[PDB]
Scaffold this active site. Sequence first.
Site, mmCIF file in Angstrom:
data_model
loop_
_atom_site.group_PDB
_atom_site.id
_atom_site.type_symbol
_atom_site.label_atom_id
_atom_site.label_comp_id
_atom_site.label_asym_id
_atom_site.label_seq_id
_atom_site.Cartn_x
_atom_site.Cartn_y
_atom_site.Cartn_z
ATOM 1 N N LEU A 54 0.828 -1.193 0.000
ATOM 2 C CA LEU A 54 0.000 0.000 0.000
ATOM 3 C C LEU A 54 0.871 1.255 0.000
ATOM 4 C CD1 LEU A 54 0.240 1.148 3.092
ATOM 5 C CD2 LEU A 54 -1.305 -0.773 3.572
ATOM 6 N N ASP A 55 0.308 2.344 -0.524
ATOM 7 C CA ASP A 55 1.042 3.593 -0.659
ATOM 8 C C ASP A 55 0.812 4.488 0.558
ATOM 9 O OD1 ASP A 55 -1.696 4.343 -1.524
ATOM 10 O OD2 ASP A 55 -0.725 6.251 -2.003
ATOM 11 N N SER A 56 1.424 5.674 0.536
ATOM 12 C CA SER A 56 1.362 6.567 1.688
ATOM 13 C C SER A 56 -0.069 6.988 1.997
ATOM 14 C CB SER A 56 2.245 7.788 1.441
ATOM 15 O OG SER A 56 2.310 8.089 0.058
ATOM 16 N N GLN A 115 -1.746 4.253 3.679
ATOM 17 C CA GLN A 115 -1.427 4.200 5.100
ATOM 18 C C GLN A 115 -2.221 5.245 5.872
ATOM 19 O OE1 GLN A 115 0.034 4.104 8.044
ATOM 20 N NE2 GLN A 115 0.477 6.258 8.502
#
Lengths: 52, 84, 112, 52, 175, 318, 98, 114, 156
Positions: free
Chosen positions: B39-41, B44
Amino acid sequence: GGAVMYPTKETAHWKPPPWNDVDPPKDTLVSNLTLNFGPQHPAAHGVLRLVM
Amino acid sequence: PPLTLEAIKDRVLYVLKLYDKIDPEKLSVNSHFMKDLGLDSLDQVEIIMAMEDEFGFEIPDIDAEKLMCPQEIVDYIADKKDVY
Amino acid sequence: VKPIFSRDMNEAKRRVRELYRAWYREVPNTVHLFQLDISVKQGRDKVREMFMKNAHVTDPRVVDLLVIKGKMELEETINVWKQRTHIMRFFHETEAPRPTDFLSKFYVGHDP
Amino acid sequence: VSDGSSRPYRCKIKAPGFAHLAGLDKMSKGHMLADVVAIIGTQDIVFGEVDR
Amino acid sequence: MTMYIAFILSTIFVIGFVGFSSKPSPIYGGLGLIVSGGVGCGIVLNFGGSFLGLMVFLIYLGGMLVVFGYTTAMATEMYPEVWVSNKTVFGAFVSGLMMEFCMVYYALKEEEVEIIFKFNGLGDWVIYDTGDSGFFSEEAMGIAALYSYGTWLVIVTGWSLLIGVVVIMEITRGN
Amino acid sequence: MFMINILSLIIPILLAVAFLTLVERKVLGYMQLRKGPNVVGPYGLLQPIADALKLFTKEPLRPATSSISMFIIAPILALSLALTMWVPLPMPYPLINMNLGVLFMLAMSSLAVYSILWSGWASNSKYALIGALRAVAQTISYEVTLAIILLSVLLMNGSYTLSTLITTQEHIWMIFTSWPLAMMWFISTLAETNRAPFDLTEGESELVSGFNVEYAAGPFAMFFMAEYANIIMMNAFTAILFLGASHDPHTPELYTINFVLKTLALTITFLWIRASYPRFRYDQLMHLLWKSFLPLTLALCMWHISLPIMTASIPPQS
Amino acid sequence: MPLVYMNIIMAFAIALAGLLMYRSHLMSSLLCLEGMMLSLFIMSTLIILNTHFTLANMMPIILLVFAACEAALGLSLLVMVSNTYGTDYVQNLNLLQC
Amino acid sequence: MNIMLTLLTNVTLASLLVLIAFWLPQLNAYSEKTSPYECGFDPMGSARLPFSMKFFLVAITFLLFDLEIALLLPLPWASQTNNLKTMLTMALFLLILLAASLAYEWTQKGLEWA
Amino acid sequence: SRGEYVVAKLDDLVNWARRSSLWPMTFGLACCAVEMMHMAAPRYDMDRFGVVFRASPRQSDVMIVAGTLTNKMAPALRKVYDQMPEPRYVVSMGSCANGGGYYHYSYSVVRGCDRIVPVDIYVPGCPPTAEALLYGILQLQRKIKREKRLRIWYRR
Ligand code: SF4
């Protein structure tokens, strides 16, 4: 020194009464009504969206 | 109502399971999001928002980025909720 | 160079994440108030797409100005300054799909 | 501003209504809706000037 | 049917009471109170109390006005409730209407019903008196004796009203 | 034949309301250097009929947020109450002769207010709510002073029977006896009918249309008819109360003609005031009534209570 | 007793039950109090008119006067409660216990 | 019964007019036409939210004064008594108490708003 | 046919009522509104013809788009038109409303109100003279006079 002697489990969490006064529970209690005065309004001169 | 550490772990895992982008099989307490789950920022950030909704306590920006491990989320939640 | 709000890229990223949080939480309220027929997931996907469009920015000042513009748009949406037309303009429903393959562009028109 | 050509480079119109409508909020403080209509009337705002 | 105008009006009165007592939003409860006040005026006028009935209607019409304004100010809700918007309000309304219908049919059919007191189903016209009041309205003459006989009642009521104005001012000071 | 009488009272009154609209439009236009409607019909006579047909052939819209039951009930209440109040009036002989007709009219006027409040609340629009609250404030301002003035004037009558007013004013108009109460009463009638300078509920300039902003076609026509009928009825009440007329029992037509002319003059005065003066602020209206009218009305009520006693002029009860 | 007395006493009973069974709003219970007062006015007026108790035809008017006094008191308290809590809900009158 | 007949006739006329208004015309009701009116732009909140009444005290005092209106209406018949002295004294007592109440509220800044 | 005659006469009555009582809504965007007020002024008083300005869209029958319609104002204009009950007629006054006029190539101007709302009568001019606007209103009245709703209902 508790609010009630012989406290129960639920009452134990409850705090004792304030000495002088209860704290003000002011939290967004009053929400000012928002009105679009114009543009179509006769007094808005037709092109004024006065959000009041 | 003792707010057990394993109950906190269960709630965190349930929240992570609900998030579609995470694949259920490879989800783990030690599976770091960015590398383990991919998953990407912003992903998150969304997972942190879900956690803060579930536990009802707002996680500040600085603390949230220090996350990316579900175990880290669990321990931070325990610290905020004074568990053990 | 004088920083607009952030002296380095990490601070601007923090501001961007804060703005993304704000939009993400606002999306369901927008669907409820504007009586939009899109689902909450659809609006949040549109929010991600709008954020991703400018994901190539590498200059802190540009990112800060983009965050300012996004905050202004969020203020518009949080109020009802923007109408359902403005909110749904992000979804280009009326516009027809435009082919991007070379052959389709060649067939359709002279446009490069 | 003129660049020496036959067409103006920049033309900025200072409309008196702009600042009056800006101050409308300060003037309206402590008044009711009809007072707001009267205040809009007093500043004689033609929105062609204000919006240009 | 005109032989029992009083009974029909009293049933309408009880229905209005079952309306404002089931506690819909204060607006519809005020509607019920207004309807009941009008019907009570009708009953009192049928018994010969024109002034009293009209006075009740006038006073409750004004009173429910302030109630309506207060509601739109304090007792307000985003989705105001009608007698068919909640199972509790509709339960109360239906129970009240059914309880009326029950006692109504019971007393009308049975010669002598006795719920808590004993009631006779004979029309109200029976009880009326056969005397003549001549050139007088007994209700008006009695109500006018408040100034000639009821000086004590006038004193008490006037003091109560002045102290009521004072009391409202103090209760709404709010420190 | 009583049904014929009820229809005779109802139908002509509605036509009078329709032509009152034409009269107002023309009177205001001429007072404004204009000509009122003249194109539609000779001298504009058929304009009312065209307006009624247009309104009743126009789509009625039920607001999505509206409470339909109250939304529909309110215009019915307004029109029915407006027609009802005409019943007790002596012209010269009343349709329904009541011992307490004046209190009946007061109560019915109180009831009509709920039509405005119910319409505004059911509309579920902010402007309609503002108009309803303004109507509430207006009733609060005017009801007490209206009742006290009516009581003070009727003390000379000796009863609340409207018919007996004719006998009391057989020799002189009561305006001579009570001209100050007459002035306050005329202003209070203006307030009750929500007419300029107290046209706050509708308040087009300040509120787009007030309580009726969400009403269209037939319901709006009903509200308009109720308004104009109330104007005419209140002016007729003023004519009966103060500007009494000669009644020859063998020829009632003379009294009817005199009464109709006086009521027409008072309604024309209403239109005249609407043209002349600007509109009050509802805070200012309430202040005028409570701080200025109410004390003078209390003093004059004391005066009118004392005067029959000190002058041995107590009127006959019968 | 005629049936109209039955209906009016039933109305009083219903209003009393309504007042004693609160739901959320205080205004509704004040309206139930006013309903009880109206029912009492009707009963008293009917009794006094049927029995031709002439000097008792004023008692309903005094009852109404003190009913309106009570109503004013209730509203003046409701305004303070709303100010202190933001709603007229009865559940907020919970500070004092037992 | 005449009053009942007149009320029925007027209410029936009004209801018939409402029926004719809602059935004679043609209708093309669509969502945007039946939406609430906010001078062209869409409303921000509801019209069922609380609307502060800046004249609450005057309204409660209005109730209390309508009580006095009720108490004073019998005066026309009261003037027909033989004890006109006591009647006059009590009527002036009531009117002076109403005046006193008004004066108290006025001087205590009660007739003002907000 | 007798039915055709009855339908034609009833249609005549309805059209006469609608054209005689034309209530424009109080909608003025730009300079053309001033000429509209002059039309309302005594010299060309429109009240003579039955045209009375009514603010509420629901209590109005005609919308006169006097002035330039900016992209910002267009949604409000469409909302006001939609909230207006039918039959409803739109008159576009001035070059700006008709096709954008002086500001046709501006980013913030809708190049005609026809794009947003259907228009029945276009009154040319910038600003159109009050007599021109009165002529347009009378032309709309004649257009209403030519309407055949009930005849079409009978024939359908
Ligand atoms: S058409 Fe001409 S007069 Fe009319 S608004 Fe545009 S610029 Fe002004």
